[PDB]
Design a protein around this ligand. Structure first.
Ligand SMILES: O=C1C=C(Nc2nnn[nH]2)CCC1
Length: 262
């Protein structure tokens, strides 16, 4: 047990919930884990795997990201800030990828899932890139039920950090695709209160947030600190009661503990 793990434990204790953290520091490839091998509901953090799977498909179909997808009124789910504007028209797979990643659009995610042949298509991509832990079982919005003990739509912090590293800094995607994914993550609109709130402001980052039932509050980030090699950081948090409030501040605190421990 490390000092950083003990600080994370104190944060978790005060928070009332269950916290999962995985850091990879690419300076030396060392890792800090807190409940690194426990499962958590991914919620919208799963959008990174779906967008990446479509990017992979685009490696052998140069024009795939320009392919139109019909958006019908019946397609709209519970959170559709971009898709609602395009109902009775179309959006391209690039537009859907951007909407999913940068705005957390749930209708956009469902279109990415459909393009992959269903939730199992996303899981299959995960396996193809060496992630044996990730599982996507349902579409939006039910993938966010976040029931304690339920393995559906979960991963571990350790697995997600490894995967995010391979996707954004490694060779899981072609160079063009990797750059596109990073560009999208760095353009996220939803992340200023989560991991990135706990980081020195001179640092740059991209991230994908998620939230769901049981006060589930998540963020996964790739981070470029000032004067050192990139980090990958996953912070997952979930609470015992179905209607618990979101706690982005807990993710910020976790990130701050990690940052000061470097
Ligand atoms: O509060 C909400 C959050 C949503 N998604 C989300 N939370 N963090 N990132 N994306 C969608 C439903 C309404």
């Amino acid at each position: 047990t490390s000092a950083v793990q003990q600080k994370l434990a104190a944060l978790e204790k005060s928070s009332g919930g269950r916290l999962g953290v995985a850091l990879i520091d690419t300076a030396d490839n060392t890792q800090v884990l807190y409940r690194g091998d426990e499962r958590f509901p991914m919620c919208s953090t799963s959008k990174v795997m779906a967008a990446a799977a479509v990017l992979k498909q685009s490696e052998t179909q140069k024009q795939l990201l320009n392919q139109p997808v019909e958006i019908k009124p019946a397609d709209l789910v519970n959170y559709n800030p971009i898709a609602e504007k395009h109902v009775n028209g179309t959006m391209t797979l690039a537009e859907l990828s951007a909407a999913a990643l940068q705005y957390s659009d749930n209708t956009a995610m469902n279109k990415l899932i459909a393009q992959l042949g269903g939730p199992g298509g996303v899981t299959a991509f995960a396996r193809a890139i060496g992630d044996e832990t990730f599982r996507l079982d349902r579409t939006e919005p039910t993938l966010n039920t976040a029931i304690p003990g339920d393995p559906r739509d979960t991963t571990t912090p350790r697995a997600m950090a490894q995967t995010l590293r391979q996707l954004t800094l490694g060779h899981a995607l072609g160079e063009t695709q990797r750059a596109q994914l990073v560009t999208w993550l760095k353009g996220n609109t939803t992340g200023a209160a989560s991991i990135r709130a706990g980081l020195p402001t001179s640092w740059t980052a991209g991230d994908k947030t998620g939230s769901g039932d049981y006060g589930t509050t998540n963020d996964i980030a790739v981070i470029w600190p000032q004067g050192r090699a990139p980090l990958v950081l996953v912070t997952y948090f979930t609470q015992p009661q179905q209607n618990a409030e979101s706690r982005r501040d807990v993710l910020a605190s976790a990130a701050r503990i990690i940052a000061e421990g470097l």
